[PDB]
Symmetry: C2
Subunit: 198 residues, 2 copies
């Protein structure tokens, strides 16, 4: 298996010392996908936000450690369901090539438990996107059922043919909070993109 | 309490009957509506406008190395606009409603037609999305997850579990079968839509 490198693919940057502590700024190496302007430029704990969080022993949110390393990346949206979507985006240096099969995998987390006496029960729905340029080549729109406190792996594959219109455009990844339910937060971890001849 | 099929109108595009092999309609199949969020499909269609309809895929067909997945006919969507211009396809709202503690399984066969039509190559594929709705909300969707070679069909499967806390319970279920217009030749076929519900 041959990987395409991704920056901060496991959200391990930055290091977080205290269990369940978190940042509220875009993880290094990623940008905030914000097509509906739901996430402000300047965040608090309680605005719509995204960032990184440490899942270790003593976590109140999960029934297992982080899928990879210490940290997961989270997206929280405070607007009512139906208001739009937001998430993580990363554009890669690798470009779409013909007769090549791409396999994107990411672990999707449904945080459970309670935060400042607010229940995290429920899930907003997720979408995992593989891009060339601004085009979604293939995407998993919420196909996995993920219970509170658990993670499941989403897998998206795509084969580009010689006649594909998007050849030579940069590959990208989006990890999206759909805001289709409450509690309206979800987590991602361990992003992997691998490539093989068709 | 067990696996039940939810009824869908004209679910194999068998209405209308078509006598000549590879003959087709260019109007919205009975029981479905034209999903047209980017206004790509005109209200009146001819062969080479953007359109949708049904087509007979039987012995003699120039478009597939297999017969129609179900019965005689498939349903198709063709888009004349350039890649990137938008999407269009089929939509059907069902009488059934979203119920809690249930698992839904939507299956449809997706066809990448091959061959030639009026010296126009059918090689290539626009991409598809299959959507399960409640009300206006796409609960789960297969956005082009299967690779489908020219001249074959593959079955797309979408599942969704509805919890007691789902915001859209009691809203009408719906189905969308979408041409993504992300490639040429910019037509694709669908057949054999099935929706089941079972305790979760
Ligand atoms: Ca990690
Ligand atoms: Ca949750
Ligand atoms: Ca896992
Ligand atoms: Ca049929
Ligand atoms: Ca084709």
């Amino acid at each position: 298996v041959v990987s395409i490198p991704i920056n901060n693919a496991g959200f391990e940057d930055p290091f977080i010392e205290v269990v369940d502590d978190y940042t509220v700024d875009t993880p290094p190496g990623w940008t905030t996908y914000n097509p509906n302007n739901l996430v402000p430029e300047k965040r608090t704990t309680w605005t719509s936000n995204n960032g990184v969080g440490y899942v270790g022993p003593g976590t109140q949110f999960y029934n297992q450690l982080a899928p990879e390393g210490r940290n997961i990346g989270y997206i929280y949206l405070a607007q009512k369901p139906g208001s739009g979507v937001a998430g993580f985006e990363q554009i890669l240096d690798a470009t779409l090539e013909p007769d090549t099969k791409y396999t994107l995998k990411v672990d999707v987390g449904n945080s459970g438990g309670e935060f400042q006496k607010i229940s995290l029960a429920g899930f907003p729905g997720y979408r995992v996107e593989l891009l060339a340029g601004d085009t979604v080549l293939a995407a998993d729109h919420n196909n996995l059922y993920i219970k509170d406190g658990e993670f499941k792996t989403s897998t998206v594959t795509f084969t580009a043919t010689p006649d594909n219109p998007y050849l030579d455009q940069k590959l990208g990844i989006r990890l999206i909070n759909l805001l289709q339910g409450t509690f309206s937060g979800l987590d991602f971890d361990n992003v992997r993109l691998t490539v093989e001849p068709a």
